[PDB]
Each structure stands twice: as C-alpha cells, then as structure tokens.
C-alpha cells in the first residue's frame, strides 16, 4: 500500500536522476574516432579431448593453461600452446555448468546440477588431482564461480543468491540476496574488490566483496541475462541476454551506454568477454558462431564460425593473445 | 623438435586413452531423466528400483545399466538447466492420478508435460509416462466425480473408461507425433512390471535411435 508506493517513488527518483545525468549518448561521441574494428582471426588450435558438450572454460593468469569442463564428467586442463591435455580431472557428478582457474594456478573449481562447488587442488605431492574442498551450501545449481584468491571464492547459484566462501573454512561467509531470479553469471573487477552478477530478472547487480551489500542495480534488458563481463578498466561491464542484445553498462554513470544488436540475429548471447584493451567485445551466440563487436561504435566487425553447435563459453587470455571458444560440439577452438 | 615435452605428449596420449575408455564406459550406460510434478509419486517408483541437487540412481536390469536422474527436488527455473539433458534417452514423466482432488495439480502436471514435450531440446526423446497411485485413484473415482477437473468430459465413474481418457488426454498433448512416442504405464505394487516396462520402452528407443543412425527411419 504505502511501502510499494514508496519503492515506486524511489525507483522513479533514481530513474529520473540517471536520465537527467544522461545528456550525450556515446554514439554521438564515438563518431570522431577512427573505426579500426574490421579484423580477421583464424583458428590456431582445436582442442579435441571432450566426448560431450563443453559448458565452461576459464584462462589462467599465465595464459597457457585453461580449464575446460564438459558433460562427460571430465574437467580437462589443457596447455594452449602445445595442444597438450595437462590434466583430466574426473567428476563425481558429471552435470556441470561452470569451472574456474585460480589466479595462482594451484586450484580449480567446478559446479553444476549437484549444487556443490568442488575445488580441486592441482599442485599436490601425490600424482592425481584430489578434491581439495567440497562446498555444499546452495539449494539451486551453480552457474558461475570465480576465485578471488586461493582462500576466497564467489559463487552464483540457482537459489537466487550469490555467496562469498572461505575455502579452508568450508562455509559461506557472505551471502548476497538481492536478486529475485536465478543468478546466471559472475564477473570480478580486476582489483577483486567488487563484482557484478547477471540474473534472470534482466538485472545486473554490482556487489562489493568486503561489505556484502548491493551497491548498484542495472535493469536495462527485457529478457534474462546469460553472460556478464567487466571492462579491463573495471568501471564498466557488458551484459549478454537472450534478447539478442548485449549492452555495455557504466558504473560511474549508472545506466546503459550503448547496445550491441544486429537486425538479422534473433539468437541469444551465451558468453561475453572483452579484449585486453577493450576496443572490441567478444560475444558468443547460439547461432552456432561468435561475433566481435567494435565496443565503441556498435558495428559487428568479426565473425568466428568454426563451431558445429552453439558456443557455451569463451575466454580472452590475461595477456590478450588469443580467445578460446568452447561449444557444444565438444570442441574448444582457440581463435587468434 | 621436442626436448622433454615428448613425455608430456606421451602423458597427453595416455590420459587421452583413459578419456576414450571413460567415454566408452559412460556411453555404455543408458541415461534417463526422471521428471514429475510431485515428490511422493516419483519417490514411490524410485523406491521400487533395484538396489542436495540431482539424485543419480544407477541400477542394472537384464545386463542394461540405467541411470535415473531425479531433478524435481531441486527448485529453480527449469529452462536454464533443462538443456543439460539434450542427449538423454528417455524422460520418465511420473504423475499421480489422485492429484486432481487437491489444489488443480493435474493441470499443473499438464502444463509441465506440455512444456517438456514441446521443448525444443526433446524433439527426439521418446518419453515414458507413469500414472501413479492406481488404488488411490480407484478410491477417488469411487468417492469423487472426475468431472471437477475435466469440465468437457462426460462419462461413467468407472476406472477403465476414465483412466483411458486421462491416458488419451496426456498422449494428445504432444504436437510432434512423428518422431517421439509417449509410452504409458499404470504403476503397480510389484516392481517387476514397472522395471520391465522401463526396459521395454528404453529398448524400443535404443532400436529407434540405432535405425535413426543407420538411416532407415
């Protein structure tokens, strides 16, 4: 009665404030800069080791070893340069949605329909990779987990909540309960102080790690969000939804800047990543291929069609050399 | 030229041979998604199988290794995880026949059934359909008329006509009848008939998949 009307008045207040600060769109600004979008990138490596669809992959900071998790119960850690499968971790529950690679390189994470984040210590004195920790505090399936450190990990599950965990303790320290829909993706700022989460309410919420309270909320999409990715500055992030439109959001401005949408594609974005500088935005579609948008001018520049099925995940290396796209055809192809 | 990473490539081919063996072992065993609108009806049949997230139930019947995947305990948005089960063999859709009395649940089961049948991922998946609580349904027919949940239906309060009408209404829901065939079975007290029907249905779906691969169908 009164409280819902107060919420509507506060939402109209923040919408009017972020409309009043919006005076010149970025498309008006970007007409002066030189369009250097048009590129061609051939596939250099085709990582053939999976017998089922690859749901996720992540890149190490050294940018040679990349984890890759598929439905055959296998989390294969590949060597990118020499095409060598370094590790092949067997999975207790083969139904995975995600995987992560620690910044130190010591640990990997994994999770899926078993709603349990399993963390695997790689560098051990025995030969085999053992289950380091087994985090069981979520009700819904995990969708994206990311290592802050070797000791802390964030997760985002289908029980509407995200969770900061301490790994050696084994229990969730911070719980993030702002979303109303199922949280599909996480991405961390490069200082690892704050992150953003895209959920199925078409709302990307910026959380801070230390405090544990929702700082910002970005509600610009019509359909549910599948992919989120920070800008290399850390002051912006792109958002890929099923509405065929991936749109950049500015944190300091606190609304949309621009939308990357083409007319002929009605397909959905599954994976969003940025290059090292951030001039071009990678975007994996379920049109069985991937696109490369000029992230300042919104012109579809590159087309990466080497995949026989929809690309689930893609990752850009930390040094920015290559971009590896893992699809449902059980192939992870390293474009460059 | 390769100095000591020849041994790393030997490691890659060794674990790759282990991946090939694990993939053949996992493709050996048949996978069965187990859906339903109520937990008790699915619990009744999964307690009749041979001796927190998804619940994997690995058993074996007539040298055929089944993996039931009960997901209905997990409560989340179904469209985001449903595409995990694209390469599944069969969906055992369980539904209790006494659900129409309480609250409307039969229409919820119809909506869930229409959603899984007209899902774009299960265009090839020929599904099994269990109609649970047969004795309880006989008692509900003896006590209550069936015309409450079906306004269109007009008929006698007998088990033989009403159960066949419910089976026909469930079988009528799929738009695509060419590819997938909705096998249907009434749940009995004996576990032998249920496991035998699952074996016969999955055997027919395996033979249809093999002839789809060979190219006769």
């Amino acid at each position, epitope marked *: 009665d009164e409280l819902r009307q107060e919420a509507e008045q506060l939402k109209n207040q923040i919408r009017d404030a972020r409309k009043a600060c919006a005076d010149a769109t970025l498309s008006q600004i970007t007409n002066n800069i030189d369009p250097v979008g048009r590129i061609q990138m051939r596939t250099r490596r085709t990582l053939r080791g999976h017998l089922a669809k690859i749901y996720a992959m992540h890149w190490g900071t050294d940018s040679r070893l990349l984890v890759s998790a598929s439905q055959d119960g296998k989390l294969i850690i590949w060597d990118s340069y020499t095409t*060598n499968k370094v590790h092949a971790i067997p999975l207790r529950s083969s139904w995975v949605m995600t995987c992560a690679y620690a910044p130190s390189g010591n640990y990997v994470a994994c999770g899926g329909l078993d709603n349990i984040c399993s963390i695997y210590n790689l560098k051990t*004195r025995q030969g085999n990779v053992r289950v380091s920790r087994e985090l069981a505090g979520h009700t819904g399936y995990l969708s994206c987990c990311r290592f802050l450190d070797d000791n802390q990990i964030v997760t985002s599950s289908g029980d509407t909540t995200c969770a900061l965990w301490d790994i050696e303790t084994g229990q969730q320290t911070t719980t993030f309960t702002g979303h109303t829909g199922d949280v599909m993706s996480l991405s961390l700022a490069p200082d690892t102080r704050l992150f953003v989460s895209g959920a199925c309410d078409a709302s990307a919420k910026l959380w801070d790690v230390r405090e544990g309270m929702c700082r910002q909320t970005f509600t610009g999409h019509e359909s549910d969000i599948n992919a989120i990715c920070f800008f290399p500055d850390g002051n912006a992030f792109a958002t890929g939804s099923d509405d065929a439109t991936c749109r950049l959001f500015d944190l300091r401005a606190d609304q949309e800047l621009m939308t990357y949408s083409h007319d002929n594609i009605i397909c959905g974005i599954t994976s969003v990543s940025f290059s090292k500088s951030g001039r071009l935005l990678l975007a994996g579609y379920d049109d069985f291929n991937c696109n490369v948008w000029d992230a300042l001018k919104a012109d579809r520049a590159g087309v990466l069609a080497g995949h026989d099925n929809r690309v689930s995940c893609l990752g850009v290396t930390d040094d920015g050399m290559a971009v590896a796209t893992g699809s449902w055809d059980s192939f992870l192809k390293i474009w460059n | 030229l390769s*100095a*000591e*990473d020849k*041994a*790393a490539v*030997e490691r890659s081919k060794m674990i790759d041979r282990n991946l090939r063996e694990d993939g053949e072992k996992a493709a050996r065993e048949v996978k069965l998604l187990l859906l339903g609108a109520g937990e008790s009806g699915k619990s009744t049949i999964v307690k009749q199988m041979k001796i927190t997230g998804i619940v994997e139930t690995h058993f074996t019947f007539k040298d055929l290794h089944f993996k039931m995947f009960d997901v209905g305990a997990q409560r989340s948005e179904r469209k985001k995880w449903i595409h995990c089960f694209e390469g599944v063999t069969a969906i055992i859709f369980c539904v209790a026949l006494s659900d129409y009395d309480l609250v409307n649940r039969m229409h919820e089961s119809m909506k869930l059934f229409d959603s899984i049948c007209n899902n774009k991922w299960f265009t090839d998946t020929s599904i099994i359909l269990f109609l649970n609580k047969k004795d309880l349904f006989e008692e509900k027919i003896k006590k209550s008329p069936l015309t409450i949940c079906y306004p269109e239906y007009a008929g006698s309060n007998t088990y033989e006509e009403a159960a066949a009408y419910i089976q026909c209404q469930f079988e009528d829901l799929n738009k695509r009848k060419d590819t997938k065939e909705i096998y249907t079975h009434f749940t009995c007290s004996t576990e032998t008939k249920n496991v035998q029907f699952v074996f016969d249905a999955v055997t027919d779906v395996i033979i249809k998949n093999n002839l789809k691969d060979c190219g006769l169908f």
Partner: single-chain antibody
Amino acid sequence: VQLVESGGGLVQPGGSRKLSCSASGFAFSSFGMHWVRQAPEKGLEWVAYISSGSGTIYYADTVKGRFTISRDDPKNTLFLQMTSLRSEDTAMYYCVRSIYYYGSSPFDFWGQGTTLTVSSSDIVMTQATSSVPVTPGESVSISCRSSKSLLHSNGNTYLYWFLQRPGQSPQLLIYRMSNLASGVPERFSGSGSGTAFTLTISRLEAEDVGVYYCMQHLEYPLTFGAGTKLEL
C-alpha cells in the same frame, strides 16, 4: 611419499639381480621413473627411465643392453633386472620419481637407494668446481658449464639443480633454473644464459651443506655434474 629399494648387497661379477622399488603414497601409474646410480665418492649418473604408462623406455648409452627395466602398476613396483654385471656397477642405486607436464617438477622425490657392491656425443656437464669451504651466513655461487646450449626453442632452459646431504638422499633443489621446488626454502636463485649457469645462495645454513649436482634434461641420456661439495 615413500620409495623403498630392495635387492642390493654383494653380487658376483657376471651374475643377475632384480631390484624392486616399492612405491607408496602417490599415484604411481602417472609418474615416469628413473634409476640414478652413484659410485662411492663420485658423481651421480643416470641409468634408465620408463615413461608414465610403460610407453617409452630409455637407457644410458654406456649400459645399454645389460639392464632391463620394467614397471608393475597394480603392485606399484619398479623392477630393474640386471645381467652381466661388471666391476663398474658397484654403486648406490636411487629410484627417482618424475612427472612431465607443463609446470611439472620432475625429479622431485628420490628414493633412499640400495647399495650394490660387485666383487672382483653426450651433453657434457662440466662442473669445474670440486669443493669450496664457505663460512655459514655467506652468499655462495656455484657455476655450471654445459657443452650444448640448453635453451630450447620453446623457451624453458632445461637444467635441474640438486642438493645431496652427507648420509642422505639427494633432493630437487631447483628445476628449470627459475622455479623452486615444493619444500625448498626461498634462498636458492638460479640464473642461466646459454651455456653458463649459476646457483646463488643468499644465506648459507647447516642444512645446505652438501654436494650440488647440475643435471641437464634436454636430450637422453641424462648427464649429471661432477658435484660441488661445501664444507663448513
């Protein structure tokens, strides 16, 4: 982790002998296995190798034919069958564990060794220094001259520093000259350019007193150094 050798003792020259390396406490089938001999008051020397999964066997050029190495994976035991034993084979035989992938630290854990007394084109690793007495608490520099340029085309220069203590088995000190092994203190710097290699110890301790072995891992056969002994 535990590697226990068995089968040593006094062997008549020309006789046959089987050595059993019982492995315990690690995934044995995923480790390549080495034998490394050490003659009394002489440097280390490689003998033989089996790749993980019994795929690619190797032997030293000077002992080829007489030694037959085999691996038993369910029982987790490395067998070394020996025939036509000469007077040169009286040595301590170490059963060495190694693993080969990107970022792996091979030659990490060494067996205790077995004493076997017999009655009666290679990359030369010039260890020019024999012994230097150094007072503890001082920075120590050990040089290593190699005959072939160990800098491979892929980038990682293959050279392993080992420390052997008096009365103890040798252990991996540094692998690939820029990477410390798991469990070594943070005092061992490696610096290598082309064929010149340098080990730097910032603070010398009583545990660091021993013989340093410079071993190249570019081509088979694997060649060790003569050794650099320290005396406190």
